[PDB]
Design a protein around this ligand. Structure first.
Ligand SMILES: Cc1cc2nc3c(=O)[nH]c(=O)nc-3n(C[C@H](O)[C@H](O)[C@H](O)COP(=O)(O)OP(=O)(O)OC[C@H]3O[C@@H](n4cnc5c(N)ncnc54)[C@H](O)[C@@H]3O)c2cc1C
Ligand SMILES: C[C@@H](Oc1cc2oc(=O)n(CCC(=O)O)c2cc1Cl)c1ccccn1
Length: 448
């Protein structure tokens, strides 16, 4: 049997461990954290993720989709909150087949861990990768207390997240051609209790947004009607706008409360533990990291966040990481040798990872914000109705289909260009020749 060592029992690592182990590979998975399945008296994390078609299909191939979805809340659309007006729902898709699912990260990880072990993978927790000796095919791991342990490896998979130790180790043997692009927004997680969400009639079957231009809040529901709120706000106020809100101005929980009372007045009464959450939850960082190289011969490869950290605004980090795990397991299973599998995997996935990194950055303006846009959107809706296999809004191609990300971006561009020229110099729909716009759709967009 072929052997593989995987670093990181996260989302991509555990899925790839299950896929390889059920195909007879000898799989050893190393994880820095403790096993979340061992019940402790600790107060566990309430992180929510939006699972879409790419991630759902990956779980489906692994036989874990039904179990994951039993524990997922349907989000039918985007509920936009602007003070004084009732929330505007905005369906994501055409029917209940075109939805996103809100899943608790810890519930998903336990399912994936059980799945990897059921398939035959051995999982070793409380062991963090420190360094790799590529020449001797040996790695060094340690616990939190610093006690070191060495292990031999044949194939190394770096599924160890955005601050990947495998990626850092690879940089000593190859030029990764690494380009880090920082993002000015930090993030803070806040809670809405089931009692508060019910009292304020917050819809459980939707993704909620409180747009505020340069900053915003989002909320994802849980099975028990609680919601995890995420505030996106600049770490620092720019030089040009020193008065503009930022985390640097929010000195403590009380300042955060004052800020929410002023800027998010319909949201502040639902956040009962705002002051404590603000002070005890750390401010997260966001970034895009692009690498020219994802592998070292046939010895090691990166996937998921280890390969392509992206900004969170499209909810595609996990979906892309799960899609990578399927592609990696497929390439490894059927290749002539590991070196061929890793080069083929990298060549296939890199253009698509670059496309989703770009689309995730573009989605911030779509969430946090024009009559021209409204007319384009209305025309876009008519074209999707008239031509459903040709005109598919970019959000739907990314979220509800498995079309390669680079193709969704290219088609999305043809559509934006088509709508722009069609609405130009028209105040409303009545002056636009709809049949001529439809002819342009049939001429420029091949059916999918
Ligand atoms: C709060 C939050 C919400 C998110 N919401 C969404 C969402 O709505 N939709 C979406 O698609 N994506 C979302 N994402 C992004 C998504 O979580 C990631 O893109 C995804 O988890 C990447 O999967 P991964 O397996 O590559 O990495 P991870 O899931 O981060 O797993 C990496 C694993 O490696 C372990 N590890 C790290 N360093 C070492 C080491 N040196 N040695 C050993 N083990 C190590 C970590 O402990 C972890 O278990 C969210 C991210 C955050 C932070
Ligand atoms: C929860 C996640 O934030 C998102 C998840 C998301 O899922 C999605 O479908 N979208 C787009 C929704 C839309 O355009 O209507 C989306 C956006 C964000 Cl910021 C997050 C929290 C904190 C750190 C990193 N990630």
């Amino acid at each position: 049997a072929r052997q593989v060592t995987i670093i990181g029992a996260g989302l991509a690592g555990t899925l790839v461990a299950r896929l390889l182990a059920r195909n007879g590979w000898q799989v050893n998975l190393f994880e820095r954290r403790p096993d979340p399945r061992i019940e402790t008296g600790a107060r566990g994390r309430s992180i929510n993720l939006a699972l879409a078609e790419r991630g759902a299909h990956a779980l489906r191939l692994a036989g874990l989709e039904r179990e994951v979805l039993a524990e997922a809340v349907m989000m039918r659309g985007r509920m936009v909150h602007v003070p004084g007006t009732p929330p505007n729902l905005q369906p994501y898709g055409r029917d209940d087949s075109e939805v996103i699912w809100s899943i608790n990260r810890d519930r998903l990880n336990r399912i994936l861990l059980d799945g990897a072990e059921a398939a035959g993978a051995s999982i070793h927790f409380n062991l963090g990768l420190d360094s790799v000796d590529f020449a001797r095919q040996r790695l060094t791991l340690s616990n939190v207390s610093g006690e070191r342990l060495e292990k031999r490896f044949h194939l190394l998979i770096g599924a160890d997240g955005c601050n990947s130790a495998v990626r850092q180790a690879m940089a000593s043997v190859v030029d990764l051609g690494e380009h880090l692009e920082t993002q000015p927004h930090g993030y803070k997680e806040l809670q809405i209790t089931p009692e508060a969400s019910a009292q304020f009639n917050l819809e459980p079957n939707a993704l909620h947004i409180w747009p505020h231009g340069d900053y915003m809040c989002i909320a994802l529901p849980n099975l028990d009607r609680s919601f995890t709120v995420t505030l996106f706000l600049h770490h620092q106020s720019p030089a040009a706008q020193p008065a503009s809100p930022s985390f640097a101005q929010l000195v403590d929980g009380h300042a955060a409360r004052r800020f929410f009372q002023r800027q998010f007045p319909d949201l502040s009464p639902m956040l009962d533990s705002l002051e404590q959450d603000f002070e005890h939850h750390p401010t997260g960082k966001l970034a895009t990291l692009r690498l020219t190289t994802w592998h070292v011969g046939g010895q090691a490869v990166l996937l998921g966040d280890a390969a392509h950290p992206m900004v969170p605004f499209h909810g595609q980090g996990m979906n892309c990481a799960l899609e990578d795990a399927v592609a990696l397991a497929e390439h490894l299973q059927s290749a002539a040798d590991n070196a061929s599998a890793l080069a083929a995997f990298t060549a296939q996935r890199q253009p698509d990872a670059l496309a989703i990194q770009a689309m995730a950055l573009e989605n911030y303006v779509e969430m946090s914000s024009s009559p021209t846009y409204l007319l384009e959107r209305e025309l876009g809706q008519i074209m999707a109705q008239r031509q459903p296999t040709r005109f598919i809004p970019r959000y739907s191609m990314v979220t509800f289909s498995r079309l390669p990300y680079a193709q969704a971006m290219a088609r999305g561009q043809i559509q934006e260009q088509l709508l722009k020229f069609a609405v130009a110099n028209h105040s409303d729909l009545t002056s636009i020749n709809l049949d001529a716009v439809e002819h342009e759709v049939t001429r420029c967009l091949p059916p999918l």
